[PDB]
């Protein structure tokens, strides 16, 4: 349809605020939608939504549309909002006096809260009408709107205050910046772990029994960098989950799956070396081939039971307004769980493996000083990394995970996500820590030439 | 850096005895395995006696009873007091040391070897 250059700016504004979907999706009420929040129908029939879409677009879309087609739909919604604004004696005086950029901020509010909701801002609207930008920005910052949706409102208020697109220019610079850093993190995890996996499979010297456990670690860390970290990066750079409610449950399960398998494998490796370093002869006899494959299967079976079973059975769901809101919203994929699962998952994933690894590696330090310049220094710094890097990466998260479940207000969501990325970073550190043998080095060099 | 010296090798008649001595210089981690390996012409390398820093032993069952391995208190040396020699024990005996300074893997220290031929 007819596009303008103003029209494209208000399109990119909400593309950032609300997201763009070029395929039919469901909104918070289960209603079929496309584009930037364009309701197709309240009918539960996907074909009926496809008929409404084809009538409006003027093409057999079969549910998929282009960006230009989404802008056609978007501009119609903007025209309707504007016609509403002009019929309302509370919004027309303010609207008529605003420049085009601040005029898009007001339309943004109406898309978020509705015509009636925005008309209740009597005093802020009067201040905007009188071009009292800083005073209007202060008053709006005190709003219920600001406290409910601070990031959205910071961007909109900056638009009222300055009349520029700076808040959205800055958001997009940040988005590309983190996307770079995320892709780098994804590269290190995948490369380092795929390098360890192939080194074991193409070298008979490396196919020992201890390194069979390290293959489990490298595999639990490989799925992390292929499925968990990449999709977890989409929530950071785009502020939303973009893949529907069903994939949020699966992604969350694969997340808890791999984190459980990876840390418990560090626990098995910690036990393995303890037996070989202390009682190497009973070690070589009791730990058979099938027993080593017995532990790894047990680790993964436990990991599936604590991830796919409770999450898909909705046992992990909290029952507050904040939690139920995120569950009904496909665009929300926050890790919000009840107290029982938050503790039970933390114990099975982190706290039990921490206690074993801490106790085991402390006793290796004990029996080393009993049977004594000395090389005890080079082995102590080694233990300091195996436990230091592990603890430093996951301890902040699993402290916040248990606390936040009881006191939701103490752990900010920003800080909570950050602690979870420290743990994500362990999947890159593990191949550096556990594959430092001369056998790996001769193999790594033989793989890269 | 770390070198291990290898003494006690020689030729002896069937039924005699020997006493291999291996002294390892350099610094090593407190938990280790000092062992002896033999390779006869033809057949590949095999272990005879290993001794852990705690005291636990492991003797090849074709070799146990006749052979005894020991460690020195406050000295990085291993002694293989061997008796009742048989002509099937003609092999170069190697001194091996398992270092556990890096906790995740084993770090082998090998030796040059001492020839041992048993006559009749
Ligand atoms: C060595 C390891 C096992 C020690 C870690 C113990 C952890 C799990 C402890 C340390 C501090 C503890 C928290 C301290 C305070 C509170 C507030 C309380 O009203 C509910 C429990 C809660 C939230 C505790 C949960 C358990 C907790 C997080
Ligand atoms: O004409 C307004 C019309 O469209 C609105 O679309 C908004 C929606 O309010 C928000 O949730 C967000 O997604 O942006 C959408 C883009 O239009 C509403 O969806 C609709 O109900 C309203 O009448
Ligand atoms: C080691 C790399 C750490 C990067 C972690 C970035 C997390 C950031 O805080 O994102 C929070 C929210 O914006 C997302 O919901
Ligand atoms: N994203 C949640 C985080 O990865 C995680 C992993 C394993 C868990 O047992 C858990 O509670 C949370
Ligand atoms: Na959701």
From TrEMBL, chain A:
KW Hydrolase (keyword) present: yes
Catalyzed chemical reaction(s): Hydrolysis of (1->4)-beta-linkages between N-acetylmuramic acid and N-acetyl-D-glucosamine residues in a peptidoglycan and between N-acetyl-D-glucosamine residues in chitodextrins
Domain of life the protein comes from: Viruses
Enzyme class: hydrolase
SUPFAM superfamilies the record matches: Lysozyme-like
UniProt keyword annotation of Hydrolase present: yes
Active site: 18 (proton donor/acceptor), 27 (proton donor/acceptor)
Gene Ontology process terms (BP): cell wall macromolecule catabolic process; defense response to bacterium; peptidoglycan catabolic process; viral release from host cell by cytolysis
InterPro entries assigned: Endolysin_T4_type, Glyco_hydro_24, Lysozyme-like_dom_sf, Lysozyme_dom_sf, Phage_lysozyme-like, T4-type_lysozyme
Family: Belongs to the glycosyl hydrolase 24 family.
Function comment: Endolysin with lysozyme activity that degrades host peptidoglycans and participates with the holin and spanin proteins in the sequential events which lead to the programmed host cell lysis releasing the mature viral particles. Once the holin has permeabilized the host cell membrane, the endolysin can reach the periplasm and break down the peptidoglycan layer.
Name listed for the protein in its UniProt record: Endolysin
Species the sequence originates in: Enterobacteria phage T4
Gene behind this protein: e
């Amino acid at each position: 349809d007819y596009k303008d250059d103003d029209d494209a700016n208000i399109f990119e504004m909400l593309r950032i605020d609300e997201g763009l979907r070029l395929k039919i999706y469901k909104d918070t009420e289960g209603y079929y939608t496309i584009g930037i929040g364009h309701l197709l129908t309240k009918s539960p029939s996907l074909n009926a939504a496809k008929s409404e879409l084809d009538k409006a677009i003027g093409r057999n879309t079969n549910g998929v549309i282009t960006k230009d087609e989404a802008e056609k739909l978007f501009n119609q919604d903007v025209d309707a909002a504007v016609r509403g604004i002009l019929r309302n004696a509370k919004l027309k005086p303010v609207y008529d006096s605003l420049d085009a950029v601040r005029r898009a901020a007001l339309i943004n509010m109406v898309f978020q809260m509705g015509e009636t909701g925005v008309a209740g801002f009597t005093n802020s609207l009067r201040m905007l009408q009188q071009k009292r930008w800083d005073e209007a920005a202060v008053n709006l910052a005190k709003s219920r709107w600001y406290n409910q949706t601070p990031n959205r409102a910071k961007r909109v208020i900056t638009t009222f205050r300055t009349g520029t697109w700076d808040a959205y220019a800055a958001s997009q610079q940040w988005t590309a910046g983190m996307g770079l850093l995320m892709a780098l993190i994804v590269l290190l995890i995948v490369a380092g772990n795929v390098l360890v996996i192939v080194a074991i499979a193409k070298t008979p010297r490396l196919q020992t029994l201890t390194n069979l456990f390290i293959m489990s670690l490298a595999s639990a860390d490989l799925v992390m960098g292929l499925l968990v970290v990449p999709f977890g990066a989409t929530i950071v750079v785009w502020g939303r989950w973009e893949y529907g409610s069903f994939f949020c449950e699966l992604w969350t399960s694969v997340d808890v799956l791999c984190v459980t398998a990876s840390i418990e494998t560090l626990c098995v490796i910690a036990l393995d070396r303890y037996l070989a370093i202390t009682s190497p002869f009973r070690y070589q006899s009791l730990l058979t081939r099938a027993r080593a494959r017995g532990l790894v299967c047990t680790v993964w079976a436990i990991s599936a039971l604590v991830s796919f079973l409770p999450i898909l059975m909705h046992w992990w769901r909290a029952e507050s307004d904040e939690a139920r809101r995120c569950y009904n919203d496909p665009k929300c994929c926050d890790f919000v769980t009840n107290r029982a699962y938050a503790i039970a998952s933390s114990v099975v994933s982190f706290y039990v493996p921490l206690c074993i690894m801490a106790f085991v590696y402390l006793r290796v330090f004990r029996e080393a000083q009993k049977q004594v310049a000395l090389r005890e220094q080079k082995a102590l710094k080694t233990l300091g990394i195996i436990m230091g890097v592990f603890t430093l990466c996951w301890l902040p998260f699993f402290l916040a995970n248990v606390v936040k479940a009881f006191h939701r207000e103490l752990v900010p969501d920003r800080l909570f996500v950050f602690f979870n990325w420290l743990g994500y970073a362990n999947s890159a550190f593990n191949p550096i820590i556990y594959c430092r043998s001369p056998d790996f080095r001769k193999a790594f060099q033989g793989l890269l030439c | 850096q770390v070198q291990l010296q290898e003494s006690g090798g020689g030729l002896v008649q069937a039924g005699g005895s020997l006493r291999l001595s291996c002294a390892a210089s350099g610094s090593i981690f407190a938990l280790n395995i000092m062992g002896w390996y033999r390779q006869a012409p033809g057949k590949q390398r095999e272990l005879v006696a290993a001794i852990h820093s705690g005291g636990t032993t492991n003797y090849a069952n074709s070799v146990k009873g006749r052979f005894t391995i020991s460690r020195d208190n406050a000295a990085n040396t291993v002694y293989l007091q061997m008796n009742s020699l048989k002509p099937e024990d003609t092999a170069v005996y190697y001194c091996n040391v398992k270092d556990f300074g890096a906790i995740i893997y084993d770090y082998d220290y090998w030796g040059q070897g001492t020839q041992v031929t048993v006559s009749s």
